[PDB]
Design a protein around this ligand. Structure first.
Ligand code: SAM
Ligand code: E45
Ligand code: ZN
Ligand code: ZN
Ligand code: ZN
Length: 426
């Protein structure tokens, strides 16, 4: 009993469309990955299986590349890990690119695993590769990835008989480029990458009618707007804090298409995103490169230092609605939360609220979680009426974007009940 179906679109390959009208919040599909792996910066910081950042992680005794929070996670991961383990070990000093480790797990899954429910609607076989649109620059990078895969996997895979029938590594990597999902933890931090072939039927819109959220490696696909019968289902492949020009470059470079949506035609929100003096936000955009690199490696004290140099610069400053200033405020907030600097975190967090309202319209999981963070900071600091407003706002959003099937809704409900009990006591 599904409310969605595969169909051949007029000009964007295959897509997913509603078989019946859908309401905001409706669960449309849920999937474990065909294959997934922790990303580089989070390796050794989060559990390889559940992708949570425990304080204590045990590394696998053979390879010592995979780390686990528990015996339970080590066992649930052993089928997925058992053959890559010998490869990671054979290349003891070197570590492969995420894409290479991912495709290794794909190969082992397809060779050794039962048919995956993640492929119910659409299989890895079926995925778009866009090879006839790749630049020769891109094709050259794919060729290098193929040779990297051949090197990394030589201990377990020496020839084609150990690959699925007529499995082509070049085409496989081309598929990974435009069908990889960035797995986010409950705090919306990027922690892993995975393939969800059924979900890969969703085409892109900068104004989508559906949204995905992750609960560990588990993916929930939900409607975030009313959707009519026969209407194509879309998600936004990209970060919302991007101008139309930046979205153009990514959708070209990674997904090989020219976005024609109404937002890109109208340059919707571009002007407000780039307010302030250009030479200032050019420098911030450059600094953000290393800030996000540091954040990807959970380097919070260094993240905070770079952000303070910007937020409290002795030189000219930017409005908080400037998307680069906004990104800096958000990184500083997360840094302060992880360093226990809760007053400072709330200062930065509250500054992001109105910009997030503008740039994450409707029901977007990123805004829901941001508002929940702010409400939780306020609750801990005894600002109950303010916390309650933000916690209910987060619930308004996340009952649509997350739903009862996501464990964070249970946590939010408990915060609401705690905050309400404090307000009632008077
Ligand atoms: C995750 S797949 C989506 C399903 C894909 N259409 C298929 O047939 O398998 C992403 C690819 O679909 C195409 N695509 C996605 N969104 C598009 C859009 N809005 N306009 C044109 N092509 C799009 C691009 O080729 C992109 O690389
Ligand atoms: C049980 C083992 C051989 C396995 N099944 S799927 C995968 N990646 N590994
Ligand atoms: Zn775990
Ligand atoms: Zn291992
Ligand atoms: Zn667009």
């Amino acid at each position: 009993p599904l409310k969605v179906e595969k169909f051949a679109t007029a000009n964007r390959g295959n897509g997913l469309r509603a078989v019946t009208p859908l309401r905001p919040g409706e669960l449309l599909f849920r999937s474990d990955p065909l294959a997934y792996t922790v990303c580089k910066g989070s390796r050794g910081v989060v559990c390889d299986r559940c992708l949570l950042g425990k304080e204590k992680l045990m590394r696998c005794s053979q390879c010592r590349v995979a780390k686990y929070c528990s015996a339970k996670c080590q066992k649930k991961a052993w089928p997925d890990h058992k053959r890559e383990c010998k490869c990671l070990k054979s290349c003891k000093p070197r570590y492969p690119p995420d894409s290479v480790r991912l495709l290794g797990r794909v190969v082992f899954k397809l060779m050794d695993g039962a048919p995956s429910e993640s492929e119910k609607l659409y299989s890895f076989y079926d995925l778009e590769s866009n090879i006839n649109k790749l630049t020769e620059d891109r094709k050259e990078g794919l060729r290098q990835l193929v040779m990297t895969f051949q090197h990394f996997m030589r201990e377990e895979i020496q020839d084609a008989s150990q690959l699925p029938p007529a499995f082509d590594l070049f085409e496989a990597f081309a598929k990974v480029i435009c069908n990889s999902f960035t797995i986010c933890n409950a705090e919306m931090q990027e922690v892993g990458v995975g393939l969800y072939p059924s979900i890969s039927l969703l085409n892109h819109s900068c104004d989508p009618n559906c949204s995905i959220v992750f609960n560990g490696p588990h993916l929930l696909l939900r409607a975030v707007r009313d959707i009519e019968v026969g209407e194509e289902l879309t998600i936004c492949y990209l970060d919302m804090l991007m101008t139309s020009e930046e979205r153009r470059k990514q959708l070209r470079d990674q997904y090989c298409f020219e976005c024609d949506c109404f937002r890109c035609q109208t340059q919707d929100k571009d002007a407000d995103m780039l307010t302030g003096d250009e030479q200032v936000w050019k420098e911030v955009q450059e600094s953000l490169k290393k800030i996000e690199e540091l954040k990807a490696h959970w380097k919070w004290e260094q993240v905070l230092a770079m952000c303070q140099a910007i937020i409290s610069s002795n030189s000219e400053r930017l409005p908080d609605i400037n998307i680069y200033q906004l990104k800096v405020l958000d990184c500083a907030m997360d840094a302060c939360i992880n360093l226990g600097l809760l007053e400072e975190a709330l200062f930065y967090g509250t500054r992001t609220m109105e910009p997030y309202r503008i740039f994450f319209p409707g029901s977007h999981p990123v805004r829901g979680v941001q508002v929940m963070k702010v409400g939780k900071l306020q609750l801990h600091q005894g600002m109950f009426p303010q916390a309650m407003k933000n916690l209910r706002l987060a619930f308004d959003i996340m009952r649509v974007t997350h739903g009862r099937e996501h464990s964070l809704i249970e946590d939010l409900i408990l915060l609401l009940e705690e905050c309400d009990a404090n307000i009632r006591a008077s």
